[PDB]
């Protein structure tokens, strides 16, 4: 599939469909985030509705009942509370796709600058200085779904890029730009993009004006890494082609955002759907919980108790009406009809209209409005709701909160979810000697497990670390004025460095460190530019982030780092400023893991070489003549100290060299750029030869910071018994620190890394996909006793408990390839990350990270959560149970294409646990509740079939019947589903092994919901042959001697029967009892009488005109009122409290220690995550 | 130049008891010492309740009588009822047997071989029944209970409107279906098959003292049904012209209806008795009351016209004389099953009391946790 794509140029004949149109049309810029299109939404809405089984058999029996009639009839109000349901329930999922879609509109509504004054053929030197100038050529504003294949755009700085684009030239002359690519991988830094080299002499709308060419391109093929196009136009001096390659490096992808660079001028290539990012997103599925598939399950076992009884009935009644000597020959009119089989046909089609109510119409509104309920509860969280950036947790998907439940798994992206992206300058080692004070939360949780009690001690050090700032803050004004400083954002804090910096550890240590910090303030990238709103401020703008924060530390100490002349760069130092002269450059490589500048020493001067690097890549480089020996250890021995600390580090190295000695390595270098064929190794070797010796002045380490309360809820989450995995697309090394920040990885802890590396590749096998599968089979074979067979997995699916053994995977994504390709090596991998406490995948695609979810979520069917920001967790997050993106302060598609989302990573915690917890339970009782209150009613129908020869009257009253779901019973079993609470959220958050259950599915199954469906069977006998019995002996159960015969005052008997025992079944199986409930289940009960009486005293009610008054007039009435509800209650009350008392759940022990005040200090909105948080007294 | 230009160029939730999930409410954790009480009060007094309705339904005295077999199994001359047909009891007197006695008296003027003379039933009780004496009538084996039998009936008529034939008939739901007009073309009055079939036998408005014929006892059909019944049971509009008998009343109206003679379904508790129809296979339904006088202990006699047919499906019919209870009849159901289940309740407190008492653990322990254990 290639296109090409023409600017300024007609297309060609073949080109156009035959009436000036193109053949190939290219997909609307427009990015479309709903479960449903406008045209699609019925169809797709009415077929996930009736993939419930209970739809069907709904629909069937009205279709049924309506073409052939038969008995009962009256068709038309028959069809209504179907039609009704469904039309309520897909009018509630079009406001939820309806939000979906108010996003997606403020996304297509971004402005852009598109050229205008040339017409777009594409969709309805290089430069011609003769060609005529049109005014009326201009860049103007527009949206991003106009931006069409072939347009010219113009991106600002900080703009994000609207679509696939290549670059044709930027306001830097050479053409460079700056991409950040946080959004399609998880890198922190900024990458360099090179504009064509052709097109970089247009800056203007008049010269792309007077430009021409065309670009074949390969198709969208969704890898982030490849590009392949060739750009191509005619010489204006010469009739002929010309041709230029465009890589990867020339190309802006949909995601990024343009960044130090004042305009990007580029042509569209690819738009909507055949960008990268989309072409790796997916298109929203509609999730269905868990607890509501196995519903259907249910569905489908209320269908066979029917069945059965409907066969029971028909046989019965056809077996009758072979009978002789019967009343309904004398009185009745009544003829023996041939065919007794096809008699109990339709005695069995009867009965199925009798017994309807078995499978209750109320069930999926009522499941639909509890789960809307909790997503509003969800949503109206104040805990959840982040000040910040004015963001609730907003619920995409309001019918998964139970997902949140019984969660095992939470795959996390690395970089924006676990990192807020900033970095800090915190620890510098100097000469052996170590300077910075910092106290993380992971330092508190690891004293924590220590023992140490460590709110006092955290709140201590940190007041202590707040004095010594302020102390070296003041100190550091004395030392001297510096243009510069800013003490808003100093986040060195040693006190001791600034202290020592005058004279304290000695004059030779004076000079270290001053000279430590002018080489950090002189080895580097970073660009000054002015502040817009303050003309004496600079800004630092820098590719790397890290590489600002030592500049910006270098400036406060007073080293500061001020503009740039034609030739070095001017410090100020302690307020008087020197500009240096930088004699060469070597730029940081991917390949060199080391940058380094050289520096004019004035006399005859000298060079100074200062090269900063990874710690191995610059201990490596070192002299053994001088280095003390000792600032070697000790520099070792604190780097690492930090990198434990979770601390990127680096090392500095100056090495002097005399002029000769430059005079010919600069020559030498100076043919080794200046020659061509792949210069690339020609400076490698030369850089090669100067830095080989070097001696090692001192290293740094900045922390990537992590969100507020990350370890907290890490930590809290693993308590529950979830295991995390962090999939990043960031370098392995970046992620390992992350890991120790955030205690996922500690010390004593084996690293178990996947490497596919050649030097390992000479031991384990010939080459990758055998040493892939030679690694994963050694580790399994080693460190546990298990290799991966069928078996293995099957036995690991068993249990759920928490892994042991302090071990880590590290894969990234090459030997990931191979450890997801085949069926056997994805069994043993996946058998060896489900131990393994810690999982990290780097370096990883969203493909991959998608592929990592969906290998858990299949083997070991499990409920699996994944969170992140960005276009890699979209594909993570639509293919996992519960999607979480994490909102910030532009628009993220993470965030739209997800279920719920927060504002911080530390809400999980709170939103996960409380929710989940709540949901997973309040669903658990609600579902079963459900079917055995209804079953009570139905089931007397049918006893009282035994009487009437299972001919089909009706025990109750036909109002009865239906405000049997509609009125009496309702409101209880809903408000338990939404209002229940096990324990508050507080001891949710104290005790979060409360939340195992779920885990472990205790809470759900087939064999709870057929115990219900049991105690339903044994309470509708309870109340059907209470009443039949006080009826059988002489009928008459009046004071009076008059006559309550009517089968419908039996049936009031058993509805009251039914109702109070089936209301204080549901009141006894709430764990808290509210004002709100109880209100609503007292009101149930009153309005089952109420009815009666109101119904009854109306002439409208035939045969039950006074049914009220002749009834609960009735002394028998409130004997077998009181009777019958004991025994209905007894039975499941006895064993509730054998249960309480012997075999106890931990929800109910927990309980227990509720009201003996073992969480009575606790207050009342209590965020253990929450770093502001109130001390609590134990 | 157009670079120059381009460059020139809250939501926090209601904090509120009710949306943050806080209302105020009681969260009962059972525990043994509050559970074990509730089931002894429960137990006691449905204990108390049980025992004192077995004491006051055994003072219930009561007189069955089966005369469905009277008009081949009576004679002429005065007979003892077979045992199978009969039961007394009277709680003053357990050992009663004294069987009653019956007698056929034929009418060979009536020409409905089937049924027809007069039973005649002599009973003594030696008790007296109190001043509201129930003279109900029994039907075994008549089934009022199925499915177009239970729905055959006009509401309109029973309204005291004039229904016309298609609203007789066509009506959703109940309608008269099989019975709603005769071959002539005039509607069934009572249409439909339960008033067609209403219960025929004529019972007396007295029980004879055969010892001292100077002191009768009187029975009523009046107040034999609910008053606010004739609210609902209106005095009908037709013309007499319009309306026919149902095909089973005419032999108590052999011409049809005429001026004077359509039945007064308001006043008619016997019909309005009949018009409900009985839930279950065995169906009383009261005919005779008296409201006034103590019915003393002597013999006396009930002569009962036989109209209804009953043997050709096996069926029977009976007089059951009562006075009654608060809870209705004499049934000891609802005595013996208030003292099962106190006793239940009881034997569960002591069977929970002694599993505590040995294998009882200590309430809140956190070390009785899952996790601590494991
Ligand atoms: C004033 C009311 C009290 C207020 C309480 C608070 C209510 C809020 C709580 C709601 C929980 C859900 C309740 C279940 C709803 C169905 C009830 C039912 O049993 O249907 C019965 C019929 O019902 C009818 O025939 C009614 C006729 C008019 C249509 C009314 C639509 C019913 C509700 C539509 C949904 C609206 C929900 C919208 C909410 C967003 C069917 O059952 P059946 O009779 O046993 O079977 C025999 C069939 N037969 C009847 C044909 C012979
Ligand atoms: C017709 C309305 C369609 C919209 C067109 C109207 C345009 C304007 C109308 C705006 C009004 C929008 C209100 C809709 C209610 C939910 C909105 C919401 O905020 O959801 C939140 C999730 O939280 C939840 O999950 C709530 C649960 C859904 C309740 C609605 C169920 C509808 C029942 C159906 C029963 C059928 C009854 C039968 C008879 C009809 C998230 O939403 P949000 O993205 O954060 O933005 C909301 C707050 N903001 C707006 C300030 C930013
Ligand atoms: C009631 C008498 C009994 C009647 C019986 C009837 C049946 C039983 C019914 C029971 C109803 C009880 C549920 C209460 C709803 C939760 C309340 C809440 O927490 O507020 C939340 C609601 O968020 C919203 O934006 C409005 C949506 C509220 C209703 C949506 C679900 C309704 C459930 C019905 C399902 C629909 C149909 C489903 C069809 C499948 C959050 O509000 P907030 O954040 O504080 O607002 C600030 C907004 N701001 C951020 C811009 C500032
Ligand atoms: C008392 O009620 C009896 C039952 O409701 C009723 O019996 C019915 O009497 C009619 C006669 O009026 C019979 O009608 C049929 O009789 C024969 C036999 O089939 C036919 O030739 C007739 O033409 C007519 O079809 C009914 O069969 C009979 N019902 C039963 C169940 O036996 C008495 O008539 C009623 N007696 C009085 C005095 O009202
Ligand atoms: C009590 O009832 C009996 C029987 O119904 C009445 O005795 C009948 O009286 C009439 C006229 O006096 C006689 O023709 C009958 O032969 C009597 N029948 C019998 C069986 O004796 C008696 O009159 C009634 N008592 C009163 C006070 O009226
Ligand atoms: C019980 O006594 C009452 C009061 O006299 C009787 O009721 C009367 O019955 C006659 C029928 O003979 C009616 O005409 C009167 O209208 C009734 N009066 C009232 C106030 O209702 C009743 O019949 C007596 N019961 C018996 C069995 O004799
Ligand atoms: C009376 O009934 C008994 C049994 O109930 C029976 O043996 C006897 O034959 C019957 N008498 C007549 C005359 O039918
Ligand atoms: C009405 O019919 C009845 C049937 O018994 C008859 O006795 C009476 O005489 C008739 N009406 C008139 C006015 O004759
Ligand atoms: F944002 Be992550 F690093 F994939
Ligand atoms: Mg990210």
Not at chain 1, 720 to 741: C, H, Q, R, Y
Request: hydrophobic letters at 40%; glycine letters at 6%; aromatic letters at 12%.
């Amino acid at each position: 599939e290639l296109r090409t794509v023409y600017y300024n140029m007609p297309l060609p004949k073949d080109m156009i469909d035959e009436e000036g149109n193109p053949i190939m049309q290219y997909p609307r810029n427009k990015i479309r985030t709903t479960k449903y299109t406008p045209l699609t939404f019925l169809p797709k809405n009415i077929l996930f509705q009736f993939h419930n089984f209970a739809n069907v058999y709904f629909l069937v029996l009205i279709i049924l009942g309506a073409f052939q009639i038969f008995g009962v009839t009256n068709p038309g109000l028959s069809a209504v509370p179907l039609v009704v349901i469904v039309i309520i329930t897909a009018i509630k999922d079009a406001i939820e796709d309806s939000r979906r879609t108010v996003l997606d509109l403020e996304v297509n509504n971004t402005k852009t600058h598109i050229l205008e004054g040339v017409e777009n053929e594409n969709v309805s030197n290089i430069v011609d200085r003769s060609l005529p100038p049109r005014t009326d050529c201009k860049f103007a504003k527009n949206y991003w779904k106009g931006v069409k294949v072939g347009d010219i755009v113009r991106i600002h700085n900080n703009d994000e890029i609207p679509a696939d684009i290549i670059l044709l030239s930027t306001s830097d002359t050479d053409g460079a730009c700056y991409v950040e690519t946080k959004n399609l991988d998880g890198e922190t830094n900024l990458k360099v993009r090179q504009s064509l080299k052709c097109t970089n002499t247009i800056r203007t709308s008049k010269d792309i004006a007077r430009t021409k060419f065309w670009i074949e391109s390969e198709g969208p093929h969704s890898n982030l890494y490849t590009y392949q196009g060739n750009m191509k136009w005619r010489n204006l001096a010469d009739g002929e082609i010309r041709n230029e390659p465009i890589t990867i490096n020339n190309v802006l992808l949909r995601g990024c955002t343009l960044r130090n660079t004042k305009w990007a001028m580029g042509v569209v290539m690819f738009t909507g759907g055949d960008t990268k990012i989309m072409l790796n997103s997916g298109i929203t599925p509609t999730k269905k919980s868990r607890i509501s598939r196995e519903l259907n399950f249910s569905v489908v076992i209320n269908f066979v108790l029917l069945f059965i009884l409907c066969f029971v009935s028909g046989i019965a009644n056809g077996v009758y009406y072979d009978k002789k000597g019967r009343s309904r020959f004398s009185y009745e009119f009544g003829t023996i009809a041939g065919s007794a089989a096809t008699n109990g046909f339709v005695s069995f089609w009867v009965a199925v209209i009798l017994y309807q109510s078995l499978v209750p119409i109320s069930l999926y509104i009522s499941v639909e409005i509890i789960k809307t309920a909790q997503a509003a509860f969800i949503y109206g969280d104040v805990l959840l709701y982040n000040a910040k950036l004015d963001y609730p947790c907003t619920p995409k998907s309001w019918n998964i909160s139970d997902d949140l439940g019984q969660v095992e798994y939470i795959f996390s992206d690395k970089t924006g979810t676990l990192t807020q992206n900033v970095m800090e300058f915190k620890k510098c080692t100097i000469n052996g000697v170590s300077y910075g004070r910092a106290y993380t939360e992971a330092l508190a949780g690891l004293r924590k497990r220590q023992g140490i009690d460590v709110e006092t001690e955290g709140r201590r050090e940190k007041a202590e670390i707040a004095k010594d700032r302020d102390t070296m803050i003041d100190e550091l004004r004395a030392l001297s004025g510096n243009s510069q400083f800013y003490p808003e954002e100093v986040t060195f804090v040693s006190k001791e460095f600034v202290r020592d910096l005058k004279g304290a550890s000695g004059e030779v240590q004076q000079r270290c460190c001053e000279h430590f910090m002018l080489a950090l303030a002189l080895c580097h990238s970073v660009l000054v530019e002015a502040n817009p709103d303050n003309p004496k401020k600079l800004d630092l703008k820098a590719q790397s982030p890290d590489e600002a924060a030592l500049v910006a530390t270098a400036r406060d100490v007073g080293f500061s780092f001020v503009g740039k002349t034609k030739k070095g760069l001017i410090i100020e130092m302690q307020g008087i400023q020197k500009e240096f002269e930088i004699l060469n450059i070597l730029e940081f490589n991917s390949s060199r893991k080391r940058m380094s500048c050289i520096v004019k020493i004035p006399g005859e001067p000298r060079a100074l070489l200062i090269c900063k690097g990874a710690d191995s890549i610059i201990y490596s480089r070192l002299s053994r003549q001088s280095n003390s020996e000792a600032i070697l250890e000790k520099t070792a021995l604190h780097l690492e100290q930090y990198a434990t600390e979770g601390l990127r580090t680096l090392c500095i190295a100056q090495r002097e060299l005399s002029w000769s000695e430059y005079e010919k390595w600069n020559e030498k270098y100076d043919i080794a750029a200046a020659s061509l064929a792949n210069r690339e190794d020609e400076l490698e070797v030369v850089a090669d030869s100067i830095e080989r010796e070097l001696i090692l002045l001192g290293g740094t380490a900045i922390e990537d910071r992590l969100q507020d309360g990350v370890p907290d809820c890490i930590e809290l989450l693993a308590e529950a018994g979830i295991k995390l995995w962090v999939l990043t697309g960031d370098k392995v090394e970046t992620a390992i620190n992350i890991g120790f920040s955030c205690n996922l990885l500690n010390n004593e802890m084996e690293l178990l890394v996947i490497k596919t590396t050649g030097d390992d590749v000479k031991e384990f096998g010939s080459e990758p996909s055998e040493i892939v599968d030679a690694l994963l089979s050694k580790y399994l074979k080693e460190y546990f006793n298990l290799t991966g067979s069928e078996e293995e997995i099957f036995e690991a699916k068993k249990d759920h408990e928490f892994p042991k053994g302090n071990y880590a995977i590290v894969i990234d994504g090459d030997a990931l390839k191979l450890a997801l390709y085949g069926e056997d090596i994805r069994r043993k991998f996946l058998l060896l990350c489900k131990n393994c406490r810690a999982v990290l995948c780097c370096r990883v695609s969203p493909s991959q990270k998608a592929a990592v979810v969906k290998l858990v979520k299949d083997s070991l069917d499990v409920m699996t959560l994944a969170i992140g920001d960005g276009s890699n967790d979209v594909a993570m997050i639509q293919s996992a149970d519960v999607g979480i993106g994490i909102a910030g302060e532009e628009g993220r598609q993470a965030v739209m294409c997800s279920d719920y989302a927060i504002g911080q990573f530390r809400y999980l915690a709170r939103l996960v646990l409380v929710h989940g917890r709540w949901s997973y339970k309040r669903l658990a009782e609600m579902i079963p509740e459900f079917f055995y209150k209804n079953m009570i009613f139905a089931l007397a129908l049918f006893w009282y079939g035994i009487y009437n020869d299972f001919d089909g009257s009706y025990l109750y009253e036909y109002t009865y019947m239906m405000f049997y779901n509609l009125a009496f019973t309702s409101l209880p079993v809903i408000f338990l589903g939404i209002l229940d609470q096990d324990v508050n959220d507080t001891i949710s958050l104290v005790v979060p092994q409360l939340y195992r259950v779920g885990i472990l599915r205790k809470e759900w199954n087939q064999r709870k919901f057929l115990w219900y469906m049991l105690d339903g069977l044994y309470q509708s006998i309870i109340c059907f042959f209470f009443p039949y019995l006080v009826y059988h002996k002489n009928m008459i159960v009046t004071s009076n001697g008059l006559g309550l015969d009517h089968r419908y005052f039996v049936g009031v008997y058993v509805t009251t029967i039914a109702v109070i025992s089936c209301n204080t079944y549901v009141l006894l199986h709430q764990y808290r009892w509210d004002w709100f409930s109880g209100l609503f289940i007292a009101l149930s009960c009153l309005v089952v009488f109420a009815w009666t009486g109101i119904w009854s005293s109306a002439i409208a009610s035939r045969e039950f005109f006074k049914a009220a008054a002749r009834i609960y007039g009735a002394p028998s009435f409130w004997a077998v009122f009181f009777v019958a509800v004991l025994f209905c209650l007894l039975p499941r009350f006895t064993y509730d409290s054998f249960q309480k008392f012997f075999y106890p759940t931990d929800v109910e022990i927990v309980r227990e220690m509720w009201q003996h005040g073992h969480f009575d200090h606790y207050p009342p909105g209590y965020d253990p995550t929450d770093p502001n948080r109130p001390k609590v007294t134990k | 130049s157009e670079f120059e230009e381009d460059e020139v160029k809250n939501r926090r939730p209601k904090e509120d008891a009710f949306t943050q999930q806080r209302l105020a409410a009681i969260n009962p954790v059972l525990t043994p010492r509050t559970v074990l009480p509730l089931y002894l009060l429960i137990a006691v007094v449905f204990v108390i309740v049980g025992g004192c309705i077995l004491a006051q339904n055994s003072k219930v005295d009561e007189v069955t009588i089966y005369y469905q077999d009277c008009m081949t199994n009576a004679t002429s001359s005065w007979s003892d009822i077979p045992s199978e047909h009969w039961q007394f009891v009277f709680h003053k007197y357990k050992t009663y047997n004294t069987a009653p006695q019956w007698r056929f008296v034929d009418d060979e003027s009536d020409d409905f071989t089937k049924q027809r003379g007069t039973c005649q039933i002599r009973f003594t009780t030696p008790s007296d029944m109190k001043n509201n004496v129930y003279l109900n009538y029994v039907l075994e084996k008549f089934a009022a209970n199925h499915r177009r039998y239970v729905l055959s009936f006009s509401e309109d008529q029973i309204r005291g409107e004039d229904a016309s034939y298609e609203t007789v008939h066509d009506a959703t739901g109940i309608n008269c279906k099989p019975l709603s007009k005769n071959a002539d073309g005039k509607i069934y009055y009572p249409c439909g098959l339960i008033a067609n079939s209403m219960f025929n036998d004529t019972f007396p408005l007295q029980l004879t003292n055969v010892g001292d014929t100077s002191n009768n006892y009187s029975l009523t059909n009046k107040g034999i049904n609910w008053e606010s019944d004739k609210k609902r049971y209106k005095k009908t509009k037709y013309n007499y012209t319009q309306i026919a008998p149902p095909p089973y009343w005419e032999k108590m109206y052999p011409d049809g209806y005429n001026e004077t003679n359509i039945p007064d379904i308001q006043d008619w508790e016997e019909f309005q008795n009949w018009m409900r129809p009985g839930a279950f296979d065995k169906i009383t339904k009261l005919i005779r009351i008296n409201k006034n006088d103590t019915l003393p202990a002597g013999e006396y006699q009930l002569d009962i016209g036989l109209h209804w047919p009953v043997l050709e499906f096996n069926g029977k019919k009976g007089i059951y004389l009562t006075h009654g209870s608060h809870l209705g009849g004499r049934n000891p159901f609802l005595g013996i099953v208030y003292l099962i289940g106190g006793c239940i309740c009881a034997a569960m407190a002591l069977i929970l009391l002694t599993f505590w008492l040995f294998g009882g653990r200590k309430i809140a322990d956190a070390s009785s946790l899952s996790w601590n254990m494991k």
